[PDB]
């Protein structure tokens, strides 16, 4: 089950950013769960932001996010400007910190920048706060694992009748 | 709880140092006064939890 | 569990008649067939008599065959031994016990089991003489280094001792009794102690005789 | 299995707590029951040694490897659950195997004990009675409560009525 | 280590909730702290962020343990923000660990 | 549990060197002793073929996942110790439960061979003897040192002496 | 372990009389009943004789019954087998082993064992003819390519051919023996080598015939 964040952020933060290696609907998108945090300016630094998500259910619900690291130190001062990046979250049960690392790397899917994926699982009525400064990938739309299911990993193809 | 007793919590005051050849943990053991986290928790819990006194 | 009582001991004078009688509880007592063997002073086991559960037969010894008799009842849980004519060789311990017996002297309950339950309890140490049940005479032995206490010239021998009333158990030694030419016997307890603390410490040793109703205490100075 | 127990005794005797095989006769005295010591001890001491080797266990001492008031991390947890459980399996079904193997093996003894006991009873009445079949001796002369008793002792001769016996069945 | 058995030290890395409260702590200057030892080496650095509050704090500390041999010497390089400790634990022996809730009979 | 080597047989043979089950007899020549060929080869291939099927054992290649000369993760250390000492506490439960078993249906299966020669011998002295029961043959009428091989080599007529031994028992 | 010593061969004469004799050693040989087997050259098997570990009975195979001898020693580990009247049915090799046998032919300390000593070690090869014993004539066959011996003329054939002492196995070719009008065999032996070291190595051939004491070396040459 997916269920919005509501985490809402100010004029000076284009949370719409796209890329050519993620097709949707024939134009440049991004994961449907997540939102790519920028400055909408070209050349200005990303506001020191702070985001709180607080869980309402009953049962235990998983966050996926992401740290983005760019290619080269232009793609960096573009994105988010030339101030020092930092990136902290916290909860009762987890508090960790990312820095944004440039680096020179090969090109996948066409680029060279990378994204690592973080992910922890929030209990019923605790809260998680994010502080960041540029280089954060929000989620826009947490998940919830309801039952329990078999996993199969398999090639062989699907008989519907047996 | 047994890293309160290494780390010296007020809630184990009573157990910072002692002999035991049954050490035996509650669901309320507290381990932090103040908040926060231990790396590799489990097994220094497992080595606190064999051992017989400290 | 394992909790019993026994009645039937004192001094009885040679000729008469012993009547014995032990009583257990903790289980089921109208199943299991229970033995009464008597173990003369010293060593030596000598078996006297079986009895069913439901005293179908006896089968007595024949060293003491039809002289003794034993007997029982299962609804107050009691086992009885009479015997007369009671010379010299019959002053020993009798005990009552359940002892791995064939099984139709046992219940059929008690069959299917591994349990193989287990017993023997106290003992009743029987004896027979010209009885002069005499009082015990006790003398302080004063001087690493140690100290005691002996019991002289009393009659008969169901005598026990200990040093504080009973807490004092470590180094001590408590000797076996040595009869003398005035039938009357002697018995020494003795305890160890380092070589520091002689006129330090309460040192009482005590001293209980069941058939006199005696009881004797002693301190010990240099 | 063995023709006794599951075989030609198409009847238990309820009535027979002196032991699990035992005899019953009927002469002229009348009706009269006991029960032989040697099988019945056979089978109670083979049953007890049994039940002693298996009641006997060191259980050599183990710790907990899995926290009880704490998360564990996903993966080792989950390694944890399927070596526990397959643990339990094996453990279940050997605990099966043991169990029906044994109860079978108790049985067949318990007919192997009243077999040899019913062979042992017709050595010593070799060529003096007939058995019909039925767990019964068709005694041909006849059997005193003395001569029951010599059965029960072992001590019964086949020497004493052998001519008899011949007599009766050849007149 | 001056012991014939292996002793157990714990410490921990302080992270404030704000930039005050690091300047009111550690000072305006770059913090870093380096543990090493013949069998261990590692480098903590303390990080502000903001964080919700439980029993009632919002800075956090984490805690790192290890064991040092007989025999062996450990270091702390620390510019502020070290949890230094006042003494080392020695574990003795085994022990058999239980965690459960039933209460305890003396009796049986 | 047959009633032959710990049943009627109250006694072993420790002179009879020469097989498992032997024939001992006293005639008017003298005292002879000889060996069964049949059951002692049958006891003897049974036995071997289990010690064949015993210890042959391929043991699928394993390798080390316990380093000796440095320290392992604390957990999965204890991990790994709950596991091998759970196959060591499995595997000395069914070595205990084979031995036991083996050795059990070894001594049964000895003691059926030598019941089942036994009856192979009665079958052959049918109707000319008697079995006094300890295991002996109380021959009614004579056997020489040749009728005793032609008992060994399965060879012995009954027919021969049936109507001698019926003219000794009735007169 | 496996290690033994044969004497007896060599070339007898029809009418005369053979004696053969095996003994063994790396276990103990006073309990485990030995066999004597035939085979004929070429193919076929046929038993001569068993013996007990104590010698009680022999039972000969009826081809030889009567004509044959077996007997062992067990104090100097011995088996030793004596035959007369040796016609052209006796020319073959006697091999002297240990086999599955009768369990009373073997001791009641091997019945208790899965281990089935196995043995049949190496042959004798008697021979029976007017006996001519004669040397071996070699000649060198020279030119992928290949290069041989071949010997001839000579009598009996217990010939052993090796390359360079013993040293080149690969691509080698032992033929058997072929018997001609003259009462004389031959054989041939070859190896083969790739096609660019004609006058390259040294070759070298080495036969060896036991009953002439013949040791022959020839080298190879285009
Ligand atoms: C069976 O006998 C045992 C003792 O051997 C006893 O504890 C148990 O209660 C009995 N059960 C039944 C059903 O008779
Ligand atoms: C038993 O026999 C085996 C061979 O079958 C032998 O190796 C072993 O030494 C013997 N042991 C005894 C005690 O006789």
């Known amino acids: 089950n997916k269920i919005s964040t509501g985490f809402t952020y100010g004029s000076s933060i284009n949370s719409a950013g796209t890329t050519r290696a993620c097709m949707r609907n024939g134009g440049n998108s991004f994961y449907a769960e997540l939102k790519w945090l920028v400055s909408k300016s070209k050349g200005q630094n990303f506001p020191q932001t702070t985001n709180t998500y607080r869980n309402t259910d009953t049962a235990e619900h998983l966050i996926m996010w992401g740290i983005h690291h760019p290619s080269s130190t232009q793609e960096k001062n573009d994105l988010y400007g030339t101030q020092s990046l930092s990136i902290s979250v916290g909860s009762s049960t987890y508090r960790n910190n990312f820095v944004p690392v440039v680096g020179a790397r090969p090109q996948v899917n066409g680029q060279s920048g990378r994204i690592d994926f973080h992910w922890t699982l929030v209990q019923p009525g605790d809260n998680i706060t994010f502080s960041h400064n540029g280089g954060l990938i929000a989620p826009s739309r947490v998940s919830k694992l309801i039952g329990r299911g078999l996993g199969i990993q398999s090639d062989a193809p699907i008989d519907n009748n047996c | 709880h047994p890293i309160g007793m290494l780390i010296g919590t007020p809630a184990c005051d009573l157990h910072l140092t002692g002999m035991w050849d049954t050490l035996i943990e509650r669901e309320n053991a507290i381990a932090y006064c103040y908040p926060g986290a231990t790396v590799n928790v489990e097994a220094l819990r497992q080595k606190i939890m064999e051992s017989g006194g400290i | 569990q394992v909790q019993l009582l026994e009645s039937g001991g004192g001094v009885v004078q040679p000729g008469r008649s012993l009547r014995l009688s032990c009583?257990?509880?903790?289980?089921?007592?109208?199943?299991?067939?229970?033995?009464?063997v008597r173990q003369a002073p010293g060593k030596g086991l000598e078996w006297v008599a079986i009895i069913s559960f439901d005293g179908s037969k006896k089968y007595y010894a024949n060293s003491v065959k039809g002289r003794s008799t034993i007997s029982r009842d299962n609804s107050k849980n009691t086992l009885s031994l009479q015997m007369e004519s009671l010379g010299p060789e019959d002053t020993a311990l009798?005990?009552?016990?359940?002892?791995?017996?064939?099984?139709?002297?046992?219940?059929?309950?008690?069959?299917?089991?591994?349990?193989?339950?287990?017993?023997?309890?106290?003992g009743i140490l029987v004896t027979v003489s010209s009885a002069s049940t005499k009082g015990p005479s006790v003398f302080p032995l004063a001087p690493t280094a140690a100290l005691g206490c002996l019991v002289k010239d009393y009659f008969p021998e169901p005598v026990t001792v200990s040093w504080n009333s009973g807490a004092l158990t470590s180094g001590v030694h408590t000797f076996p009794a040595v009869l003398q030419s005035s039938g009357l016997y002697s018995l020494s307890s003795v305890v160890t102690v380092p070589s520091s603390s002689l006129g330090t410490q309460t040192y009482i040793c005590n001293v209980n005789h069941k058939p006199s109703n005696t009881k004797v205490d002693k301190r010990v100075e240099p | 299995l063995f023709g006794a127990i599951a075989g030609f005794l198409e009847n238990g005797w309820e009535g027979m707590v002196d032991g699990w095989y035992g005899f019953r006769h009927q002469n002229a005295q009348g009706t009269g029951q006991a029960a032989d010591y040697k099988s019945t001890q056979a089978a109670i001491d083979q049953i007890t040694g049994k039940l002693n080797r298996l009641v006997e266990k060191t259980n050599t001492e183990f710790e907990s490897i899995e926290s009880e008031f704490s998360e564990i991390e996903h993966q080792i947890g989950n390694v944890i659950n399927w070596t526990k459980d397959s643990i339990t399996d094996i453990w279940t079904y050997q605990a099966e195997l043991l169990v029906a193997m044994e109860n079978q093996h108790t049985i067949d003894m318990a007919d192997s004990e009243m077999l040899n006991l019913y062979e042992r009873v017709r050595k010593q009445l070799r060529q003096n009675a007939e058995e019909d079949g039925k767990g019964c001796f068709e005694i041909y002369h006849a059997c005193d409560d003395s001569c029951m008793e010599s059965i029960r002792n072992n001590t019964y001769d086949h020497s004493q009525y052998r001519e008899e016996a011949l007599l009766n069945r050849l007149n | 280590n001056t012991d014939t058995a292996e002793h157990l030290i714990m410490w921990g890395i302080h992270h404030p909730s704000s930039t005050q409260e690091k300047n009111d702590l550690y000072g305006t200057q770059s913090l870093s702290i380096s543990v090493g030892s013949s069998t261990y080496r590692n480098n903590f650095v303390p990080v502000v962020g903001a964080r919700p509050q439980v029993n009632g704090q919002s800075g956090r500390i984490d805690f790192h343990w290890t064991l040092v041999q007989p025999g062996d010497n450990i270091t702390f390089s620390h510019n502020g923000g070290l949890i230094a400790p006042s003494r080392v634990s020695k574990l003795i022996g085994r022990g058999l660990g239980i965690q459960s809730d039933a209460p305890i009979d003396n009796n049986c | 549990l047959f009633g032959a080597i710990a049943g009627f047989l109250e006694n072993g043979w420790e002179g009879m060197v020469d097989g498992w089950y032997g024939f001992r007899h006293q005639n008017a020549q003298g005292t002879g002793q000889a060996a069964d060929y049949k059951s002692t080869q049958a006891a003897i291939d049974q036995i071997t073929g289990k010690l064949n099927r015993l210890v042959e054992k391929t043991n699928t290649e394993f390798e080390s996942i316990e380093s000796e000369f440095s320290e392992i993760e604390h957990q999965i250390g204890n991990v790994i110790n709950w596991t091998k000492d759970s196959i060591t506490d499995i595997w000395t439960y069914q070595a205990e439960l084979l031995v036991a078993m083996e050795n059990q249906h070894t001594i049964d299966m000895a003691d059926s061979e030598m019941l089942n020669l036994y009856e192979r011998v009665r079958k052959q002295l049918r109707q000319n003897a008697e079995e006094d029961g300890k295991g002996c043959f109380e021959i009614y009428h004579a056997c020489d040192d040749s009728c005793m091989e032609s008992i060994r080599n399965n060879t012995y007529d009954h027919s021969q002496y049936r109507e001698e031994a019926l003219l000794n028992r009735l007169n | 372990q496996v290690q033994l010593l044969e004497s007896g061969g060599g070339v007898v004469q029809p009418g005369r009389s053979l004696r053969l004799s095996c003994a063994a050693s790396?276990?103990?040989?006073?309990?485990?009943?030995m066999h004597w087997v035939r085979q004929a050259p070429g193919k076929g098997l046929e038993w001569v004789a068993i013996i007990s570990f104590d010698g009680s009975k022999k039972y000969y195979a009826n081809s030889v019954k009567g004509r044959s001898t077996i007997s062992r020693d067990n104090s100097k580990n011995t088996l030793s087998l004596q035959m007369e009247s040796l016609g052209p049915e006796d020319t073959a090799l006697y091999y002297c082993?240990?086999?599955?046998?009768?369990?009373?032919?073997?001791?009641?300390?091997?019945?208790?064992?899965?281990?089935?000593?196995?043995?049949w070690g190496q042959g004798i090869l008697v021979t029976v003819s007017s006996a001519s014993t004669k040397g071996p004539s070699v000649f060198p066959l020279a030119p992928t390519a290949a290069l041989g011996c071949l010997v001839k003329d000579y009598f009996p054939e217990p010939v052993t051919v090796s390359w360079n002492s013993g040293a080149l196995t690969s691509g080698v070719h032992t033929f058997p023996a072929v018997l001609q009008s003259s009462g004389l065999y031959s054989l041939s032996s070859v190896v083969t080598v790739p096609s660019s070291s004609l006058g390259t190595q040294t070759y070298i051939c080495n036969v060896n015939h036991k009953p002439s004491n013949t040791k022959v070396d020839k080298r190879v040459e285009p």
């Open positions: 790396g276990f103990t040989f006073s309990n485990y009943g």
């Open positions: 082993a240990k086999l599955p046998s009768p369990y009373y032919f073997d001791s009641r300390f091997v019945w208790v064992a899965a281990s089935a000593f196995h043995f």
